[PDB]
Amino acid sequence: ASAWERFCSFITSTNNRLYIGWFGVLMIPTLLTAVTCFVIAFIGAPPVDIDGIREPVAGSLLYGNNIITGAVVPSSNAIGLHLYPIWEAASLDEWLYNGGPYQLIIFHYMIGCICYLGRQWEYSYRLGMRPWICVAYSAPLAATYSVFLIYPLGQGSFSDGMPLGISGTFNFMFVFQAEHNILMHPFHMFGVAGVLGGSLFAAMHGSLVSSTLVNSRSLHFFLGAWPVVCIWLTAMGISTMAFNLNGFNFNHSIVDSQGNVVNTWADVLNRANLGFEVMHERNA
Amino acid sequence: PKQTWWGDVLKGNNNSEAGKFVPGWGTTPVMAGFVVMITLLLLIMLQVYNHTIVLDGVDAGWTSLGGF
Amino acid sequence: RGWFDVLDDWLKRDRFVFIGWSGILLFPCAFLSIGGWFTGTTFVTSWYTHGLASSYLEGANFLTVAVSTPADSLGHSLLLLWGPEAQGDFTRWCQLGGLWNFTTLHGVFGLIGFMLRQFEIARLVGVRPYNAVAFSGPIAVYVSVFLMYPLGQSSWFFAPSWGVTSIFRFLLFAQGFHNLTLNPFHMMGVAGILGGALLCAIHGATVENTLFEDETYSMVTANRFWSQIFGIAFSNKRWLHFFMLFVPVTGLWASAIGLVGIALNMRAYDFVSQEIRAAEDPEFETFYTKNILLNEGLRAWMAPQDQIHENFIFPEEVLPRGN
Amino acid sequence: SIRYWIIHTITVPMLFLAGWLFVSTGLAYDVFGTPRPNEYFDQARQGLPLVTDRYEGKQQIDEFT
Amino acid sequence: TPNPNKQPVELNRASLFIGLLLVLVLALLFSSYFFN
Amino acid sequence: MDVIAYVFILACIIGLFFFAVFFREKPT
Amino acid sequence: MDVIAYVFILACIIGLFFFAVFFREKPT
Amino acid sequence: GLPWYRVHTVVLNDPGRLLSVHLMHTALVSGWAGSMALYELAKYDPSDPVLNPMWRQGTFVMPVMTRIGVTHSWSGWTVTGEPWVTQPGILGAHLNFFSYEGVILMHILAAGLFFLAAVWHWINWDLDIYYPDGSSEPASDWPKIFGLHLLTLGIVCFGFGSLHLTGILGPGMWVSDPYGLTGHVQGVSPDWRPFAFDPYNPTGLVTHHISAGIALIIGGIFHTVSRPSERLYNALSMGNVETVLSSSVAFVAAAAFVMVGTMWYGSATTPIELFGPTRYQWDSGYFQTEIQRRVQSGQTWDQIPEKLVFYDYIGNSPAKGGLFRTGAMNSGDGIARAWEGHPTFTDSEGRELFVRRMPNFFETFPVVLTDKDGVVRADIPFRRAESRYSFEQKGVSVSFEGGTLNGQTFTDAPSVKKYARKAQLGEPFEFDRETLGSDGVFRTSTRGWFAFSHSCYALLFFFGHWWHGARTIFKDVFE
Amino acid sequence: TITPSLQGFFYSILFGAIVLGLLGGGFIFFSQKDK
Amino acid sequence: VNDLGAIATALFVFIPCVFLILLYAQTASRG
Amino acid sequence: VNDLGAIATALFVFIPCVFLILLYAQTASRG
Ligand code: CL7
Ligand code: CL7
Ligand code: CL7
Ligand SMILES: C=Cc1c(C)c2cc3nc(c4c5[nH]c(cc6nc(cc1[nH]2)C(C)=C6CC)c(C)c5C(=O)[C@@H]4C(=O)OC)[C@H](CCC(=O)OC/C=C(/C)CCC[C@H](C)CCC[C@H](C)CCCC(C)C)[C@@H]3C
Ligand SMILES: CCCCCCCCCCCCCCCC(=O)OC[C@H](COP(=O)(O)OC[C@@H](O)CO)OC(=O)CCCCCCCCCCCCCCC
Ligand SMILES: CC1=CCCC(C)(C)[C@H]1/C=C/C(C)=C/C=C/C(C)=C/C=C/C=C(C)/C=C/C=C(C)/C=C/C1=C(C)CCCC1(C)C
Ligand SMILES: CC1=CCCC(C)(C)[C@H]1/C=C/C(C)=C/C=C/C(C)=C/C=C/C=C(C)/C=C/C=C(C)/C=C\C1=C(C)CCCC1(C)C
Ligand SMILES: [Fe+2]
């Protein structure tokens, strides 16, 4: 009953309402920090110079936006990959102006996510069950790390990271499509197949069980495995596109015998990408 | 179970022949023909509305309002 | 035993596959739809309707073949092989895009036949036909996208051409012109699909990781695990599986209502207060406004070639840019 | 087993060649109206043959042809 | 004369929480458009 | 005032989470 | 629109009278 | 107890209480009809029938009333553009009573009566009629009840077609010209020649409701006498009311789809004087073609009837609205007051060019003034860009024929730009927003709201049909 | 008077009758064969 | 914004909520 | 008039009403 032993028996105990565990020891502060800062910076936060051009972009509720259009703007383009802690800032108002809250939120959130995976494993151990829920959870984890961490690393700044907002997500998707043509990348096709097929198999399994309940184990194995594998693949696809290894490109493929070019659907898709791109790229 | 007057009037229509059917197919063959008939009728109308069929002197458009 | 009973018993007889009455509608229609698509990709081109090379003879790729939609001038003509357009000429029927109508209509009747088939099979086995009700969602999506949408528009030309890159063109067109991503019904559809995938994944993993060392898995351990890890858990198996059924289907139906709304240009294209506030001062910039700008750019840069029939001519001066 | 092997050996390559010749002899272009690689444009007919009328589409293509 | 067909209506706690979550989430989603 | 509507709905959601976590009827 | 508020409250009062008259639990 | 989504099954086995809830639903529906019409009357502007018709004003039920006879109001005004004359003088001239308020009063009265009947049938749930001669279990014969109902509806359909629609003993129906100029409520005469299948010729409607009416009467009589067949009776489970529910829901969904088709594509039932122009009359240049031909037919520009030019505005199209842009159209671009007149544009060289009109699709369009020969002459470059074919660099005057700006010539570059944008929005018009705080963004007419709402309803009711068919066919399993 | 479009529809009824007749005939005939 | 936007949101939040709470309460009072 | 007048009147009408109806319902469900 050493004080240290008593503490350990408290944390690694299956009688709390929510299991804490050693991974949860890191999970709780980081997640609480991320949630608190996200709430604060989503309700009210100054406009952020996303383009690093002294011109700001607002995203908070008190500055005009609603839930659909509000967001937490990524840290400024001038910062690059530099960590921007509050104590490493010239002035609080400036630190907000450069987009520090985004950095705070995403870093605490990513650490909390990986610790949450660890906590899942730990409790599976403490209860005496095979410890592979965490393996399945590793897929959406990979996806978030792709959009928030790996893509900015490949692109050199967190200004290319995903905004934390509903409309920011769509803006990110369209700019990503413009610059990398993700639709014609096979890994995203695997991901689309994964989500749609996962819904299909979920509906089929639920209908069958709820209809007759009024190797079969391999059935549930396949249920678990299919969408997880596809999400791993599409997360890897995003990560590869973060290193300028873009998808397929079939523009200007068929040419007339004399030398003219006959259009195909890929050219229409490329022209749509061209529109998205030229609307992007403020200057050149 | 009130024995109202209107109930006396209408009980024969309510459930005099409740649960009675004629065996076999009965009039079902005849019904078949009727269905097919309407299956043409509706079809024709659709095509007339669709301008697949162009009846003579029947311009399926706003011009046909001429005369009012 | 009349001819009808003989026919019925013959249909219901056990074979490698089950035909049933539904088969009479499903198999010919499904086979014709598939054959129409294969023919349209292999041989027929869209050089006359969209001015594209969407066939293998043209030299296209598997990702660029497409049974392209009929021309714009035809409106919503059914394009029968013997109609006023084709007039019995097979080649003109193919060039005008009649293969699109062939494939889509026979696909509709194949889907109807499949739903009827599931009704019939559940009737034979003697279990609740939740499978048919589940399949009702895909039929809603199909009817909303391939029939109701082009019917609410000017022509079949605006329907999704059967393909891969053609479907991608349809997605980008919908974003550019209807701003679909901002539609709440599409948001419910996305939530339904992603939640269905989530449910499949975690249900499979849980059942695998609570297996008894021999239904067949420790429901008590699974319940306690999820309660103490996530907070909430299913304590009822029937509810668990009905929920798995319910979520993706509901997502599909919500998206279907979203798609029928945009078929009438009854689209959630903008937020009025944001437009007003942006008009008042030019400094006010949010992600929604930049999405609007992207939509303007995509419309301008895609319209001259997507809707080639309209003979749009926009010079370089009028094309929006980030200057 | 063995019997059907004779029939399939005699037939399947004949069908394969049937499709092969259907393409090679240029019959497909006539059947499906698909232009020959030189038929997309003349030496200067670089305009596109797009149908503009619903009612007389086949004749208009005949003009485009 | 009493009606035999009368039956009560049941809704346990879990169902209440599920329903409230559905309602609140739908309201949050659609308010941004209702305010337009 | 929209901000008040959004914040009120959100606070109600969080309260619902609190009650759904710590006050669910015991499974049995 | 005040007229609508007044009329709605009044109609609710009349409905209350109807239910209070013809649907009161039997005294005993 | 029952789950919250099955609470109403407690009337499945009780014919009396089932009838009671049907009567209550009918009372609600009639009450809504009355209340909605009352609200529309209380928010209406009868002064302007030309540049502010009912469809511009967000009316929903008024066009449906007006379709088959009701035009005037007890306050006097008619929708056809004349104060109502009490042409009624005799019996069979109730026309002075059945104005909008008369219909409202009758519907509210029906609501009350149906509510009272519903209460009565709820209390007296155990009438002897619901029970057969010698069995305690209530049991109704659905086939004969269907026959009786069908016969009643056939009689009413035949009466509607032959008396009301023909105008023999009724107001007739709304008819109009191909361009929505003259709108009468006149009787129609039925003709069985094939052109009565033209959906835009009203003579079909009467011809339908007569013949179809008779077809129902025969169809009623047969079912009032003929018994079902064991084969069908067992297959469809005619002893179970759930099958009636399934089939009825399917029928109603099909009806909704057909109605949506007619509403969106226009027909004789939906005239543009009532519900507004379709979205295809803008696409096909229907009104622009007509006007251009009329002017080209020697008439001067100022002599063009203003309804015909209002129809050529794109703000009237039902395909320019939004899902959450609420209220009447006049809450949008504002209420129109005057037509500025047909503008024409000329460049420095004096060549006459035209502005390309914005299609239904585009929320915004690039303004491009092009030579009639297909060569772009001038334009308005993007928000801030340097140009070579430009508005000022080339210089453009605009001159207006007819209307408010008659004979005028604006060469002020902001003025030319404003009227260029107006010209690409159809016909230039005087719009007021100060009265209503209008938002400048468009809204859809009555036609669009009908199409959208009932397409959604039909889509949902198909799923309802599938579910209830499933619960009928699988009845032994669903328990 | 008959127009080309109406004649086409009549030929459609002929062809559809033929298709349905051949399908139904095949089904019923084969069902009768292996009674 | 729409003056009725807040009212619509409030009624949407409230009516199903009071319905559900009423059902649960009259369930839980019963044994 | 006051834009909040209607809201105040509505909430005054509603809150005690739903309270009373809830109490009566959870009384009547119980025997
Ligand atoms: C416009 C370009 C485009 C189109 C048209 C398009 N996609 Mg995508 N697309 C997909 C489907 C899809 C379908 C079915 C589809 C057609 O219907 C499309 N797409 C279409 C999915 C397979 C896949 C996305 C699936 C997906 O969402 O992946 C998981 C990603 C995340 C963030 C999961 C988050 C996990 C976190 C632990 C959550 C915990 C925090 C939470 C607050 C906790 C709350 C708890 C409590 C309080 C309630 C996808 C992607 C993705 C992208 C991108 C850039 C795109 N896309 C782009 C497109 C991914 O990065 C991305 C990708 O692959 O990277 C992972
Ligand atoms: C008197 C002559 C006649 C008339 C006018 C008439 N009936 Mg009948 N009739 C019925 C309804 C009815 C209605 C609703 C109705 C008026 O609208 C009529 N009838 C009218 C049913 C109650 C009853 C049998 C019910 C019954 O089984 O009907 C057949 C079954 C079904 C599923 C209907 C088929 C519907 C399809 C799913 C539609 C799919 C649409 C498609 C996707 C796209 C369309 C394309 C288009 C362009 C072509 C009936 C009978 C029956 C008969 C007979 C002989 C009749 N009738 C006769 C008539 C039965 O055997 C028989 C009977 O048993 O009498 C007691
Ligand atoms: C949504 C698809 C659908 C349609 C359109 C539909 N039903 Mg059902 N349906 C019934 C009647 C019915 C009628 C008379 C009818 C056509 O008029 C329909 N249905 C139609 C009852 C016999 C039976 C029980 C009914 C029953 O229990 O209803 C209880 C419902 C309650 C307390 C509220 C539900 C909330 C709604 C959001 C109401 C919103 C207001 C309204 C929208 C205003 C617009 C009016 C109009 C335009 C819609 C039934 C069921 C049931 C279901 C389900 C899933 C459905 N349905 C579904 C449908 C049962 O479990 C269940 C079942 O049978 O399980 C045993
Ligand atoms: C792209 C997405 C997608 C596809 C491809 C798909 C495919 C399928 N789902 C089925 C079933 C189901 N899907 C269900 C729920 C879902 N299905 C979903 C999404 C999909 N489902 C979603 C999101 C859900 C969750 C709600 C259920 C509940 C079922 C079933 O019960 C059923 C099954 O048992 O599956 C095994 C079909 C069974 C065979 C059949 O009837 O074929 C379709 C029949 C016909 C007649 C096809 C006709 C031709 C089609 C319509 C058009 C032509 C297509 C070309 C041939 C190819 C096109 C290629 C493209 C690149 C354009 C089929 C395998
Ligand atoms: C005209 C006036 C109309 C007024 C409004 C009427 C409103 C009626 C009530 C509407 C709401 C009903 C809710 C019932 C809620 C309820 O009790 O559900 C639980 C219930 C359980 O059914 P059982 O038969 O097991 O038990 C029934 C009893 O518990 C209750 O009757 O199942 C369903 O209702 C099936 C559908 C579930 C639907 C919800 C699934 C999704 C939940 C999560 C979604 C939101 C989160 C998304 C995150 C991204
Ligand atoms: C499968 C796959 C994944 C792993 C790699 C691998 C290379 C193996 C790859 C396979 C690739 C290959 C070579 C696939 C070959 C696919 C093809 C072309 C299959 C095609 C079958 C063709 C069919 C049905 C055509 C049927 C045509 C029909 C009815 C015609 C219908 C008709 C129409 C269209 C017009 C009117 C007249 C008529 C007759 C009614
Ligand atoms: C009681 C009495 C007896 C003797 C005769 C006398 C006349 C005195 C009689 C009195 C009768 C009177 C005054 C009857 C009045 C009846 C009335 C006003 C009935 C009600 C009509 C209102 C209805 C349906 C409600 C519709 C509301 C719905 C859909 C719900 C949601 C809505 C839907 C789903 C569509 C979009 C809009 C909205 C609001 C979201
Ligand atoms: Fe399972």
Please render the helix and strand layout as text.
This is part of a larger assembly, with eleven protein chains of nine kinds.
Chain A: H1 3-11, H2 21-43, E1 71-72, H3 92-97, H4 100-127, H5 133-155, E2 164-165, H6 166-180, H7 186-212, H8 216-241, H9 265-279
Antiparallel strand pairs in A: 1-2
Chain D: H1 3-24, H2 27-32, H3 57-64
Chain I: H1 4-33
The structure holds chlorophyll D (CL7) (3 copies), pheophytin A, 1,2-dipalmitoyl-phosphatidyl-glycerole, ligand 8CT (2 copies) and fe (ii) ion.
Pheophytin A sits between chains C (30, 33-34, 37, 103, 107, 110-111, 114, 131, 134-135, 137-138, 162-164, 193, 248-249, 252) and A (196, 199-200, 203-204).
Keywords (chains J, K): Membrane, Photosynthesis, Photosystem II, Reaction center, Thylakoid, Transmembrane, Transmembrane helix
Pfam families (chains J, K): PsbM (PF05151)
Main location (chains J, K): membrane
Description:
The PDB classes it as photosynthesis. Keywords: Photosystem II, Pcb, photosynthesis. The entry is titled "PSII-Pcb Tetramer of Acaryochloris Marina". Chain A: Photosystem II protein D1 2. Organism of A: Acaryochloris marina MBIC11017. EC number of A: 1.10.3.9. With 68 residues, chain B is mostly helical. Chain B is 50% helix and 0% strand. Chain B starts with a helix and ends in an 18-residue tail after the last helix. Chain C is mainly alpha-helical and 323 residues long. Chain C has a domain at 3-182: Photosystem II protein D1-like (Photosynthetic Reaction Center, subunit M, domain 1), CATH 1.20.85.10. Helix content of chain C is 60%, strand content 1%. Chain C has a two-stranded antiparallel sheet. Chain C is flat, with a radius of gyration of 25 Å. Chain C starts with a helix and ends in a 17-residue tail after the last helix. The relative contact order of chain C is 0.10. Chain D has one domain (1-65). Chain D has helices at residues 3-24, 27-32, 57-64. The longest helix of chain D has 22 residues, at 3-24. Chain D is elongated and about 60 Å long. Chain I is an all-alpha fold and 35 residues long. Chain I contains one helix and no strands. Chain I has one helix spanning 4-33. Chain I starts with a helix and ends with a helix. At the A-C interface, α4, α5, α6, α7 and α8 of A face α5, α6, α7, α8 and α9 of C. Bound molecules: chlorophyll D (3 copies), pheophytin A, 1,2-dipalmitoyl-phosphatidyl-glycerole, the ligand CC1=CCCC(C)(C)[C@H]1/C=C/C(C)=C/C=C/C(C)=C/C=C/C=C(C)/C=C/C=C(C)/C=C/C1=C(C)CCCC1(C)C (2 copies) and fe (ii) ion. Pheophytin A sits between chains C (30, 33-34, 37, 103, 107, 110-111, 114, 131, 134-135, 137-138, 162-164, 193, 248-249, 252) and A (196, 199-200, 203-204).
